[PDB]
Design a protein around this ligand. Structure first.
Ligand SMILES: [Mg+2]
Ligand SMILES: [Zn+2]
Ligand SMILES: [Zn+2]
Lengths: 114, 30, 181, 133, 147, 392, 43, 49, 65, 263, 56
DNA sequence: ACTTTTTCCGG
RNA sequence: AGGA
DNA sequence: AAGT
């Protein structure tokens, strides 16, 4: 009755952009990206991969409140390296990893006789 | 041995037969 | 239950024997020997609070009847078969309880009022109140979609028909601290 | 920009009183008899047992945020097996020339009793703790 | 509420992915607070659970009857026979990260009842509305759009 | 009811979905609300004037340190309290990954990653270290508990210098609604809004850390080890004989009454004293036999919920059941139940509950506990009504 | 429904307390809280 | 399942609630209060069957 | 009141398994423990779904219109 | 062969047991999440009821119908109704099922998921067939009727994910485990006397090496190798619950990369 | 007592309460339905006029 | 001889 | 008649 | 349960 619509979890609202990149005032070379209509599935996954980037000094994500599916992702990189890029590179890596994961599953699946 | 003393679980066989005849609202009715 | 000193073969023993229990269950299997049949064979009697004053009651028959001529540590600490004066035996102590309390699982392992609280809450629960709900025009009625009988049950529930007309559902529960909600 | 204390001690006792990963250690300096040492250690990480020769260095350097890798390239002022970082909180005058300094490594406490490290030990947040062997 | 005078309202509803799961893929229907049990001393609640856990795995009705020989130690023997840790604890994993919880959770079935009090039947607001005839003051009751 | 100036406080509206009035957990206590179906009122000011009155006089942060007892009337409760202990033990260390999230989770973070307590082998931060980020600079707090050396051996008391924890486990005494408390210091020293922020700030780092660490409580936490149960049984056994000894001594006229007391009054006082001494002895035995890994003990330790008496009754023994002080009276002629022989003054006949809740109660013990329980509920009901008029 | 057909009202020296005599005849737990506590007995 | 033991009046189901009272023709002795001219009383609430 | 389709906790299709369960009991003379497991219900959430089901529908059908 | 490795242990119509090695836990968990609530399926989402003379209520049956699993194989070639241009539904975006039942029999007449008939055009794609895993080929039991009890209704099944409703759940329970000998110290075993005795050993203990106490704690150690088991409800076949999950997640990450390029 | 010292009032709302660890100390979660019913009277001023018309 | 209070909130 |  |  005061319950929102289920699809509001994944469907982007009236003029809501998936990514809202805003710079962080407190820290140099830092940025805070708000991911609209997104949950832990993406947050923890991105944050973890950003942690595998040597040129990434700081990376964290938070789901500020649960009623609302959106997470803030903070990124701080070594001077010269742009954080927008750090996220780009990290995103690719994931897709490239999952790419081999799909390939490797299919090869092993086909091998089965059940 | 049809006159062997009764066990612990045996009391339930009497309780069962109680409600069977009496019923849970007997008091209101009777 | 009546207990009589009267027993040629030994001590003071309960008028009701294993042969009677089987004779009752012959009639229980049909669905001759009724409750009235135990009453008139004088194996059981009706005692008011006045007559209660003049009698002596055994809780358990078996534990409180024959005497000692090791012990389990997990069980609750019980007294003794000391008395040789026993005029009556208690059918089952769980019969001290009324309708609502008889749905409480292990109420003996609970704090005294927590049981009084439950014997007020179960009167606010949902579920099938009667099978004729669809043919009756009541001012308000709530029926649970998918009632489940309990996994933890009282032998007394058999008589309250709780397994046939439940109040809840067996939820898969975890006592944990999560998001702090 | 320099070391503040250096000596080698021998472990008297090891104390895991209710703590599974932490132990309070008792030691005495091989050099000066004047010097004693009580210290809490992550024994899950670097473990210690009774009668161990352990080097103990203090040092003010090698301010602001903290950087994790790239350090392969950086000059790691650790030749020591276990390193810590904490704050000074008490300067105890235990009579004579004898002094005792209290260090807190985020809860992990340390009490160093000696005499000579006068112009060295300061009531500083900037105090590392390096341990080898 | 449970059959142990333990009343409670929903605080949030989480989907299967946000929920903390057993390695066996099991997830709770309900999450109750550790803090409920000690002050209350409703031990029967935990016994209901341990017994009901076996009952579900055994497929035999669990006796929760008051005056009997059913020991908490007895029930624990049967649960270890079913491969779970005797006292019903299970190592759960955090639904958000996947990473194991440092704690083991008391996890098993417990008969919960739904009660006649539901928020949307209770909720009420007013901001100028019907007034009394005599006192010329706001009328009484949610139904009547009272103050 | 509203027997407090703090039972009516001004708040900032936050429009949210779902039909419930949501409220911060630390404000639970002043209102006295639980979430068991409790309801609450909301009144809306119509003037820019009546608004000022709410915002400037009765806002929740103003209402923190109460004149009722010159101490903070709101603290850290439940989950946050429990987790805050677990977090601050010397044994508790957090890896980079999580530390970074806990730092971002504090909304008023400086954006500075603190230097870890252990910089290699592997950088590890301590609970204290990262909770100290929630604690503002300029905050000074010292407290000594039993045997608190400046080199705290048991991690007793508290030592916070410049808004950084030096030693001690944070629990009910520090972070709670206590006179010397971290809250009282903050409210006074830093401001009411600075402290109001701190509440959230602490609960964010904590609830998050606890969300990921997990915390439970099961039947396993009421089980007292086998040898301690022998010790408890024989603890009750000797106090039962001590009672019998005074019972035969009184039937033999040898018992000499206490000045200004019946011979019987003198006897009952002694019986009731031995049985209650044993209830504690059996109790105290268990509370010692439970390791720091007992969840009930863990709650009691932080002081989040539960006390010794609750451990005692669940694990060891329930104890003497009383009605109007005097143990279960002879309602029947010279007996408590028809399952007793007349003139039975023994622990069992007069209502001493030898058993623990874990082991279960006997039908006699149950019915006696029941009489005892009933008296308390009638009192609750009578007291509630009396106490109200007194307030009026 | 059952518990309502087994209710007992006591009108108007200490009746609210659970008496020893109530053993077997009345429920020691089934009773309301408040003004009716102990004066509303269940069989 | 419906047990009966109730009535149907003007549509609704009505329960007659058992009304507890003290037994009649019973001899009872009570110590009448500290400030009283009467120390003890023997009362008999006697009414025809 | 009629077998729930899919177990509340995990989601395993359970509405089919009913008559088969009622048959592994009556006709096959098995116990509830072995019956549930023949039907391949291993997690207790699935087990409880069938084990604790009260098929009230059958009583409602006994009424005429 | 490449990056993260897979080694399938057991396979069937309903279950895939495998081991995911050289992977991040965050990756194996984000994968767990996706398989539960982000793969699209197809299930009844609109039930126009014509006649209901049953013991159950219109909406009771309604809710039931959505839970019936429908073939969601070639689901990828069905549009999400929202994205389609027709007012309401069409063949491009929906499957239309009809259900008629009546108690002709003097005995109780049962209403099964088999009793559903597809009235819409399937465009020659694999969709909307009620999943019948049943031995007697009956499928889900929707209802029961006596005599004159008729059940007439039309149903529109649509795309949707489990995030919107658990009816679009492609997977049942997902078994996930790592480090059967707690060598990571990711858990603190509660006990009475012995941690190792009181806690039962995992079956996965066999596939990993025992700790061997005479060795210090490997702090350097990270969690890789995830002993998993995915269960299909019936809609999509097991393998595809995996593959489709892997893909779905890639697609989510790609959408970010793409939306990043728009800015 | 009932009509003068105490009074039934307007601009008042009541519902079930639930705890939220993500709310601030001083804030109260208000359900949309209730916010949508409860109404503050704001005076049209040059500062608000623009916002105010948008809400109108 | 004679009066008055007792916590707060669907029909 | 019922909730806190 | 008190107090004109
Ligand atoms: Mg409450
Ligand atoms: Zn299941
Ligand atoms: Zn279309």
């Amino acid at each position: 009755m005061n319950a929102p619509d289920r699809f509001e979890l994944f469907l982007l609202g009236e003029g809501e952009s998936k990514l809202k990149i805003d710079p962080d005032t407190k820290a140099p070379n830092a940025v805070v990206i708000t991911f609209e209509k997104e949950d832990h599935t993406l947050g923890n996954l991105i944050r973890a991969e950003l942690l595998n980037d040597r040129k990434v000094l700081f990376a964290a994500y938070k789901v500020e409140h649960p009623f609302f599916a959106r997470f803030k992702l903070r990124i701080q990189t070594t001077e010269g390296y742009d954080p927008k890029d750090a996220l780009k590179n990290a995103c690719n890596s994931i897709i490239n990893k999952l790419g081999a994961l799909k390939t490797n599953f299919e090869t092993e699946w086909n091998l089965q006789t059940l | 041995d049809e006159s062997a003393p009764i066990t612990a679980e045996d009391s339930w066989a009497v309780i069962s037969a109680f409600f069977r005849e009496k019923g849970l609202v007997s008091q209101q009715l009777d | 239950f009546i207990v009589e000193d009267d027993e040629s073969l030994g001590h003071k023993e309960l008028k009701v024997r294993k042969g009677h229990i089987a004779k009752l269950m012959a009639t229980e299997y049909q669905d001759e020997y009724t409750w009235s049949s135990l009453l008139n064979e004088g194996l059981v009697e009706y005692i008011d609070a006045e007559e209660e004053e003049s009698i002596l009651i055994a809780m358990q028959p078996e534990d409180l009847e024959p005497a000692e001529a090791d012990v389990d540590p997990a069980k609750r600490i019980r007294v003794s078969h000391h008395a040789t004066t026993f005029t009556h035996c208690e059918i089952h102590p769980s019969m001290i309880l009324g309708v609502a309390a008889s749905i409480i699982p292990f109420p003996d392992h609970n704090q005294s009022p927590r049981n009084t609280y439950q014997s007020a809450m179960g009167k606010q629960a949902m579920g099938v109140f009667l099978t004729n709900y669809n043919v009756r025009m009541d001012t308000m009625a709530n029926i649970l979609y998918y009632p489940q009988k309990p996994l933890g049950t009282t032998r007394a529930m058999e008589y309250l028909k709780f397994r046939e007309l439940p109040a809840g559902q067996n939820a898969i529960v975890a006592i944990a601290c999560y998001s702090g909600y | 920009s320099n070391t503040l204390f250096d000596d080698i001690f021998q472990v008297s006792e090891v104390d895991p009183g209710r703590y599974n990963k932490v132990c309070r250690i008792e030691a005495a300096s091989t050099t000066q008899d004047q010097c004693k040492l009580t210290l809490d250690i992550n024994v899950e990480l670097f473990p210690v047992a009774a009668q161990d020769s352990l080097t103990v260095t203090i040092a003010s350097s090698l301010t602001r945020s903290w950087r994790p890798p790239q350090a392969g390239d950086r000059s790691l002022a650790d030749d020591y097996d276990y390193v810590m970082y904490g704050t000074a909180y008490k300067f105890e005058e235990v009579s004579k020339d004898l002094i005792a300094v209290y260090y807190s490594f985020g809860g992990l406490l340390m009490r160093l009793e000696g005499n000579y490290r006068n112009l060295n030990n300061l009531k500083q947040e900037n105090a590392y703790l390096l341990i080898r062997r | 509420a449970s059959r142990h005078g333990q009343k409670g309202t929903i605080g949030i509803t989480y989907r299967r992915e946000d929920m903390p799961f057993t390695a066996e893929g099991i997830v709770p229907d309900l999450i109750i607070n550790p803090h409920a049990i000690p002050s209350r001393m409703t031990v029967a609640h935990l016994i209901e659970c341990l017994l009901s856990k076996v009952a579900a795995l055994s497929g035999n009705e669990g006796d929760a009857s008051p005056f009997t020989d059913i020991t908490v130690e007895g029930i624990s023997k049967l649960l270890r026979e079913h491969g779970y840790q005797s006292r019903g604890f299970e190592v759960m994993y955090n639904g958000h990260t996947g990473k194991k919880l440092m704690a083991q959770i008391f996890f098993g079935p417990t008969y919960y009842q739904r009660l006649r009090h539901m928020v949307d039947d209770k909720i009420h607001a007013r901001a100028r509305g019907p007034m009394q005839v005599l006192t010329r003051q706001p009328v009484e009751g949610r139904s009547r759009d009272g103050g | 009811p509203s027997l407090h100036k703090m039972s009516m406080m001004a708040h900032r509206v936050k429009v949210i979905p779902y039909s419930t009035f949501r409220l911060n957990l630390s404000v639970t206590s002043p209102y006295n609300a639980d979430f068991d179906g409790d309801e609450m009122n909301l009144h809306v000011p119509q003037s820019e004037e009546t608004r000022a009155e709410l915002s400037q006089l009765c806002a929740v942060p103003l209402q923190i340190v109460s004149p009722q007892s010159n101490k903070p009337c709101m603290g850290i409760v439940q989950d946050t309290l429990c987790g805050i202990r677990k977090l601050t033990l010397r044994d508790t260390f957090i890896e980079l990954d999580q530390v970074l999230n806990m730092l971002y989770w504090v909304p008023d973070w400086d954006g500075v990653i603190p230097t870890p307590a252990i910089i290699k082998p592997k950088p590890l931060w301590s609970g204290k270290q990262i909770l100290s980020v929630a604690i503002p600079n300029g905050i000074h707090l010292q407290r000594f508990d039993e045997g608190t050396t400046l080199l705290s051996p048991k991690d007793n008391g508290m030592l916070i210098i410049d808004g950084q924890i030096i030693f001690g486990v944070v629990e009910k005494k520090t972070v709670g609604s206590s006179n010397g408390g971290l809250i009282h210091v903050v409210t006074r020293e830093k401001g009411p809004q600075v402290c109001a922020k701190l509440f959230g700030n602490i609960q964010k780092v904590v609830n998050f850390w606890l969300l990921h660490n997990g915390f439970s409580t099961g039947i396993g936490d009421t089980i007292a080890d086998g040898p301690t149960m022998r010790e408890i049984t024989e603890t009750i056994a000797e106090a039962k004989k001590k009672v019998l000894d005074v019972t035969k001594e009184a039937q033999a006229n040898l018992l000499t009454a206490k000045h200004g007391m019946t011979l019987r009054e003198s006897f009952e006082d002694n019986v009731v004293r031995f049985l209650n001494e044993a209830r504690d002895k059996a109790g105290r035995l268990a509370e010692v036999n439970l390791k720091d890994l007992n969840n009930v003990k863990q709650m009691v330790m932080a002081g989040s919920k539960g006390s010794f008496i609750n451990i005692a009754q669940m694990s060891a023994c329930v104890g003497q059941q009383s009605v109007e002080g005097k143990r279960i009276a002879f309602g029947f002629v010279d007996r408590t139940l028809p399952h007793f022989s007349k003139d039975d003054y023994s622990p069992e006949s007069k209502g001493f509950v030898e058993n623990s809740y874990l082991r279960g109660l006997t039908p006699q013990e149950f019915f006696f506990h029941a009489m005892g329980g009933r008296e308390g509920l009638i009192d609750t009901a009578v007291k509630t009504a009396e106490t109200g008029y007194i307030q009026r | 429904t059952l518990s309502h057909l087994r209710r007992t009202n006591t009108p108007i020296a200490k009746p609210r307390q659970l008496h020893n005599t109530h053993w077997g005849l009345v429920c020691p737990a089934e009773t309301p809280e408040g003004q009716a506590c102990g004066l509303v007995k269940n069989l | 399942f419906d047990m009966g033991g109730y009535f149907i009046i003007n549509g609704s189901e009505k329960v007659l609630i058992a009304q507890e009272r003290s037994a009649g023709n019973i001899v009872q002795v009570f110590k009448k209060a500290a400030p009283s001219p009467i120390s003890h009383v023997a009362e008999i609430r006697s009414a025809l069957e | 009141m009629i077998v729930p389709v899919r177990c509340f906790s995990c989601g395993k299709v359970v509405g089919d398994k009913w008559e088969s369960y009622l048959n592994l009991l009556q006709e096959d003379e098995l116990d509830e423990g072995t019956a549930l497991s023949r039907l391949g219900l291993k997690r207790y959430c699935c087990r409880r779904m069938i084990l604790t089901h009260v098929d009230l529908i059958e009583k409602f059908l006994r009424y005429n219109p | 062969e490449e990056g993260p490795q897979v080694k399938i242990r057991e396979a069937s119509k309903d279950n895939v047991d495998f081991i995911l090695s050289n992977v991040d836990l965050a990756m194996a968990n984000s994968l767990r999440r996706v398989m539960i609530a982000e793969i699209p399926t197809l299930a009844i989402d609109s039930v126009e009821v014509e006649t209901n003379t049953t013991v159950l209520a219109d909406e009771f049956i309604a809710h039931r119908l959505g839970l019936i699993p429908l073939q969601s194989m070639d689901i990828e070639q069905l549009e999400y109704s929202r994205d389609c241009f027709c007012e309401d539904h069409c063949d491009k975006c929906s499957v239309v099922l009809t259900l008629q039942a009546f108690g002709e029999s003097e005995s109780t007449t049962n209403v099964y998921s088999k009793d559903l008939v597809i009235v819409s055009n399937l465009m020659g794609r694999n969709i909307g067939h009620p999943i019948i895993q049943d031995k007697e080929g009956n499928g889900v039991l929707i209802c029961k009727l006596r005599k004159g009890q008729e059940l007439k209704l039309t149903c529109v099944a649509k795309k949707g994910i489990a995030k919107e409703h658990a009816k679009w759940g492609p997977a049942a329970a997902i078994e996930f485990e790592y480090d059967p000998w707690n060598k990571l110290k990711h858990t603190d075993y509660w006990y009475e006397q012995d941690s190792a005795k009181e806690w039962p050993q995992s079956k996965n203990c066999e596939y990993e090496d025992p700790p061997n106490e005479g060795d210090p704690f490997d702090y350097k150690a990270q969690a890789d190798t995830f002993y998993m088991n995915v269960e299909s409800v019936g809609s999509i076949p097991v393998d595809q619950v995996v593959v489709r999950g892997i893909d779905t997640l890639q697609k989510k990450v790609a959408s970010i990369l793409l939306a990043l390029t728009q800015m | 007592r009932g009509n003068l010292m105490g009074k039934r009032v307007d601009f008042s709302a009541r519902t079930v309460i639930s705890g939220d660890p993500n709310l601030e100390l001083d804030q109260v979660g208000v359900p949309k339905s209730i916010a949508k019913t409860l109404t503050y009277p704001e005076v049209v001023t040059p500062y608000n006029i623009d916002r105010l018309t948008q809400l109108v």
